[PDB]
Amino acid sequence: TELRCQCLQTLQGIHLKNIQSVKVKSPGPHCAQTEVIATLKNGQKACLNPASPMVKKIIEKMLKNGKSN
Amino acid sequence: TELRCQCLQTLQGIHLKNIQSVKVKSPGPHCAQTEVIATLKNGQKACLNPASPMVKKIIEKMLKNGKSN
């Protein structure tokens, strides 16, 4: 009934060397804000800022993982 | 020790009206392939194909959401 966001905070853009996975959970009838949650390769998690131009480079890269240095 | 992909299936173009969330889990030392998992607004999930020109338009858009019935 009274839900919110899955993340109260977010990152501005951390090294993608730690990020092992990226999860995007758009807003809803509860949270009218985005909340990107990435999984750390260490088992941790680091929320990203969907209002950052670096968050659109940490994802697209993730889907690429590695191409050539 | 012997892990694989977290996606047994995939969809090559799905409605962004059903998708409520997007999950991207790059490959690892087990699976050398991607496994995009998107959450349904019904509680279900629809695996996407990390090798489609539309799968990169259903995700990027998800981060934008836009409308909200």
From Swiss-Prot, chains A, B:
Cystine pairs: C5-C31, C7-C47
Name of the protein this chain belongs to: GRO-beta(5-73)
